[PDB]
Amino acid sequence: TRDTQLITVDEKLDITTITGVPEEHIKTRKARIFVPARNNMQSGVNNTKKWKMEFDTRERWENPLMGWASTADPLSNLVLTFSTKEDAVAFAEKNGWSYDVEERKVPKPKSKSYGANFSWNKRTRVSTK
Amino acid sequence: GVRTSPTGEKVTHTGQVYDDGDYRKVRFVGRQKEVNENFAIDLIAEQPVSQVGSRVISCDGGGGALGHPRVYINLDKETKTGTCGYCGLQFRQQHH
Amino acid sequence: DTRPTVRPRNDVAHKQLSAFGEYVAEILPKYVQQVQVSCFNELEICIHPDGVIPVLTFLRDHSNAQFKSLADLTAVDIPTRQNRFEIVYNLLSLRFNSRIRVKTYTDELTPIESSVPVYKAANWYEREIWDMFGVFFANHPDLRRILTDYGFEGHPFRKDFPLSGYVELRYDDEVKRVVAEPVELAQEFRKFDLNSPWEAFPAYRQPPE
Amino acid sequence: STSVKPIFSRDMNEAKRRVRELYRAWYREVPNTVHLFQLDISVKQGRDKVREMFKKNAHITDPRVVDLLVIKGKMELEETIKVWKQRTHVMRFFHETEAPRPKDFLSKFYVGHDP
Amino acid sequence: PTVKPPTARKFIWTNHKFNLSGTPQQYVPYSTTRKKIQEWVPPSTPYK
Amino acid sequence: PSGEERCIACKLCEAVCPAQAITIEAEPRADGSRRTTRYDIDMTKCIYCGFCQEACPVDAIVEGPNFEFSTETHEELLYNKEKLLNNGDKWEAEIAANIQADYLYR
Amino acid sequence: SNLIEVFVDGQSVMVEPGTTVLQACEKVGMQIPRFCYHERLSVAGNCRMCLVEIEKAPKVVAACAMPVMKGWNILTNSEKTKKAREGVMEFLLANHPLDCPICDQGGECDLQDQSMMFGSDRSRFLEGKRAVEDKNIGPLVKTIMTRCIQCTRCIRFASEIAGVDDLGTTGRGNDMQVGTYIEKMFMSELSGNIIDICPVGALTSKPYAFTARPWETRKTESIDVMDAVGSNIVVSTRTGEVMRILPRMHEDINEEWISDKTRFAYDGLKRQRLTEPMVRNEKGLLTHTTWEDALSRVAGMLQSFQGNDVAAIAGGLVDAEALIALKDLLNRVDSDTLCTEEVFPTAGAGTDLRSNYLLNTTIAGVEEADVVLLVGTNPRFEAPLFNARIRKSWLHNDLKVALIGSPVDLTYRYDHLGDSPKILQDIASGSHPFSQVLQEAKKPMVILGSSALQRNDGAAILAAVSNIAQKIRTSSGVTGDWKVMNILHRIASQVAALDLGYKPGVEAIQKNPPKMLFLLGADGGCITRQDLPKDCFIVYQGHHGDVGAPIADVILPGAAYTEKSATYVNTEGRAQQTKVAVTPPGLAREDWKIIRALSEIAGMTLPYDTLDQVRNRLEEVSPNLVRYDDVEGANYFQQASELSKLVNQQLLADPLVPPQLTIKDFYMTDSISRASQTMAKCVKAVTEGAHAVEEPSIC
Amino acid sequence: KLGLREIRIHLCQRSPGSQGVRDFIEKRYVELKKANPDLPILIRECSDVQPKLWARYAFGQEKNVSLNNFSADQVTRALENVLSSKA
Ligand code: SF4
Ligand code: SF4
Ligand code: SF4
Ligand code: SF4
Ligand code: FES
Ligand SMILES: [K+]
Ligand SMILES: [Zn+2]
16 A cells, blocks of 8 residues: 555644735635525526635725725635535635535426416416417 | 816716815816817717618618627607617608 | 548547556556546546656656656646645657656645656756645755745645735835735726536536536 | 655654754844844844744644744745845834734724724 | 828817826826715704 | 717626726716716736727727827826727827728738 | 436436426436526427437427426437527527627626527528517616517516516517517516516616626625515625625525515615714704714713613614624613514513414425415515415415405405404304315415504404414314414514514503613614603614614614625524625624624623624524524414413404505615615606606617 | 513424423423513524523623423423522
8 A cells, every 4th residue: 555654643634824824814704615506697507516615705995096996805806616515614624714604505396397388277377378 | 068067177978076075186286187078978969860761770880890780770669769779870760 | 630620630649648558557556546548639647646756767767658858847726625736747758759747646734755856857846836836845955935035925826825915015115125015906806707607518517416 | 544644753742843943043043134134123123033933833733734834934044044035025024014903893993894 | 191181070189189298288097987875964954 | 970989888898808907887878878987998907919909899999009108107097988088089080090901801 | 116217318317207308407417408498487388499309209309398208318419409409599699689799688698608509600691680669668677679589488477476467479470579568567576587587688677777797796695684585685796886686596485586676776775875973063963973982972871871761773674693782782781672663462472482473384385385364464565575485386286365454466366355353253263164264274374464463453463363373273183293373574683683582662662761762773763752751862873864863863874784794584584694795885884893892882891792703692592593594493382372362452443454555665665775766766657657767778 | 680681491392302391381381471471581492402591680691501401390490590589
């Protein structure tokens, strides 16, 4: 098998000291682990496959000169992509971020019948096509 | 067209003008506020309406490939004029 | 090959690279985990990280290999994996006019044996991977930052590192020197959502969970 | 799964030996740094900073993480000794231009929305 | 342009201007949008 | 040619811009037309690549022929919609002649 | 068992009989192209974009409409399938206008996207295009009907979801046009959802017209607070500004729709906003000041007074964190007078048992009921997505619905038992024929609207309806765990306030006029200064200048629901938390932070300084308030009824008239919707017609 | 003063540990509320909570009494100590 001659470290993995992140962006930031919701404007579902991790929104303000949106948040555009919730959580744990996970919202199976549109005694009969 | 505030500042075609108490009008002291003077809303209104003899007319903006994408305008409503969604020219059906 | 707009397929090179791929897997079963060839004919050997020196030495020195040039050595960060870093070696055989790719993996706290013993080109490539990804290479003649500013904290090419970083620089007249301050932007970088919600490539569709 | 390739130290006693060795090198070098770079700080100030940087990581317990901090600590020492860093890089440890930021709730409440 | 003259449009400047940087006619940038959030104005009567 | 603005606030120039030099805001005009209220090009972000004029579907944004517009301040290079409309009015005569010479290659 | 095996591209999948070829492909992960099919609308089969080859079958089938059969192999990527898609896409784009630059759907258009993925890359159409005239269906939905692709999703939705048969096709052939035929408005509490289901730019949002593009918006998944349903929403923001509101699918609440108050009231957040702290000057006028000054004036009065001399009224849009923080602060002066503007009868069990004031059946249970009895409520305008759930059960399950109250159009026919409250006594005894219907029903459901309880006789009605529920539960063959009694709330903060022990209604404040009053977003006008000691010191905290702010001594600006991460409990008792989309304007601060800051100034510091700590506190007062998206069932209905009987209050003879009778009473109901200028145009449109609401639209 | 202002009982709908508290509420709660007409006794349930009895006196002081694996009799005494003896 692997014969590097190994040690045994039983502590939880925690890499905050060796990441170079300032203090204020680890202790005070809340991550959101979620599957993005389908954009209601479209029926495609290919953007609801993967888990995402994003950070809490912080102040933006108006630039005095041009009116542009200014920020002091270095993580404002930071988004990470994972295959599973367990993968996303493990990443947040070792980086020391607190997180609120949201379980995947899966559309329920519906019973679709084209013949029901012309039912004889039910309300599912349609008045127009 | 160009209007001015009671403070004297010109109002642009978007309606922007620093209000009486805003300190940001200090950037114009010793310099000038650049306002384009040809308000496209005024100029597109000066154009005469075009009388056409069909229900549906097409506008491409003029100049062919140098205009905008070609679109078709329905002229069935006789209480208004058909308007190009790109260039703002107006069309009316000629009582046919 | 007569479809004007479609890249033609070179079946002969695909067969040769497939054969040589099995060849490397037969000789080094102790380290080789996966071998594959792409549709545009590029062979990849995926190995256990312990086999970097044995695999690279065999490819450089074996007479039916002779990959004498290290074209490139880089790293890819995939946060979703427990071993988030993918170390990639691109090698050129001038004898046979072939290229091969060898890939391995590591994480933040695991060293990878420095490959300077096989290729002296790797010295600066590993300093770059250390600096931009924070992957430690054991037994490097001198491992230190190569691209980032002196005293720079972090590893910018990690996917979780912010694009604009954490500190910016200006000249402060009070102290008569260039000082480092927390980063603020007069215009925040605008994140665009571009991915289309409709699948583009059915051949790569992954199986449902 | 808990079996992991070591970077250098096989346990936290071997790692803490390297922490002390690195503290001695940084402690000895501060007087030369203040002299060569012509810093206005005192040698006492520089040694209080080195000590402070060494307390930030005092809670660690993973030998591999300790080794990396020591590896990074020795890299920073070389840049200082060989004078690759400049005065601006040395004085970035002291954050001399950053204005003090409030720590309590009320002062932080008056300025803005940050937690 | 004496042989092949340019097309005339009404909006085209009739008087060319050279670089005005450094002068009182220079261009000063400013935001062209109007105010986004309107603030409640307290009533001006003495209540109670 | 009527004097109406060609720009329809479609924001394809803004999306394509490699440097994120373009900032646009739009709303309905008094007559209901789709028009911009903000059109800023930060000329110290721009790489003068011309992708924006390739993307525009109505030829509203062009890189003109002028190359002699050095400023004595950084703020003079942050262009808003009024400055850019004045550039078009200033340089329309030459701009149109050049578009006439090249539009069959585009 | 009953499953049949079909193959999708040679891959076996087990499906129920009746599954469509399109749904079989879903289970392997393949999404078939579509335009006319919607899973929540009836099958149409008219666009023909779902045509798919079946192996060893010559003619392609419409996947959306065709049930699978045993042994079928569906070839979704076959040459025959792909050529069908290019042909149909070719027809769809033949007459479509070249509008993508000027069309709000650009960037999020299923026509654009499916053209790129399944269509040809070029055109061979060399003819003229069809131009259709546009139709004005109201102030909220813009129609550029030249863009319509005749999928009839708007028609099927309006007929089947919204219960309004006003949209249809006129003419035939290439000139078949969707619309109303006559000049009519499609004004409904759910009308704005046709915008989303229209797959093209034919139907777009007028308030949103031209402002942004899809790619540049940041999406924040948050919660609606315009009612007590708790619709999951997406807030689109761009450069720190809220741009629009969209539904977010949540199956057990709002499905994928939202009401028009939820969708178009956000423009109220940009008007009449409180942005700075204010105190009264010498002339007796509100003037701007600093946080230090205003909170030192409030602490001075707070410290001097004590006990009953301190009271607070909470408004409709107040979150749980701000509620508990104010309860702690008032408790430290020893005041229990924490009141709410919304009245709930306190006699009997009152708020002691959760089951007393919750919609125990849950919104999802409506689909399983057999008989629904609505007592004194217009659920159409009080709970638009709850009403839409009744109609879905009415439609697909043959639900029998009866109403005790004023006769109001609910979009589905119902049995109008009458309006007098005395009928409730008849139903209990067995006199009224409906009593047999309730007794035989396997899974009955009784719903009492919180608007009914606002009457002086509320304690009576709640007792009567509770009695009706008990007999048909305990004394009939209802399943063991079917819960019958339900209360439908209309106020976002009510269920959270009651869970925290807030006293419902301003009775206590009237009984003991206090010398200091905290109006925590209380804009209902329930307590006025004619009811106060005349030297009362009113501190108003909120985000809109509406009713409370002009009568306050001190104004403390807060954050709207889009500007904070706050907990709300819906009418079922489900806890849901919003997220920050944009930060508060000006000097406004988070609501619970103001109270925590005020407490420290008054030497009464609270034991929480972060959002996580103020949510550990919510866990100590009610553990369910920190279980997000989880409905915690209540129980002990038998005990609640026993206490209810003791007092025996007397019903009145007034008819049960709901507060909202027509659509015009729906739009402006709270401070955010009163400030909205879009709801102002909505009210004008439904009271004056389209004559003065029309706007010229070109693109 | 220094008298009890409010009581809260937390318990799980189904866990065995709360079985004692559930029995109390079914049988004795009605009498308790009739005995103390104006004291708010809030019985708030939630799945998988260690049952507890929170008592809140004047000026915000609070006490917590565990009820884990209690019996209906023990729960009655626990409430009696709170109602009768007020800090
Ligand atoms: S020329 Fe400048 S503004 Fe235009 S796309 Fe290129 S970088 Fe952007
Ligand atoms: S300049 Fe052209 S591409 Fe840019 S927004 Fe205007 S019309 Fe669209
Ligand atoms: S609906 Fe609008 S965006 Fe979609 S294809 Fe038609 S014009 Fe383009
Ligand atoms: S208006 Fe939209 S939803 Fe209605 S039929 Fe036309 S394309 Fe379909
Ligand atoms: S989706 Fe099947 S025909 Fe329209
Ligand atoms: K639409
Ligand atoms: Zn035109």
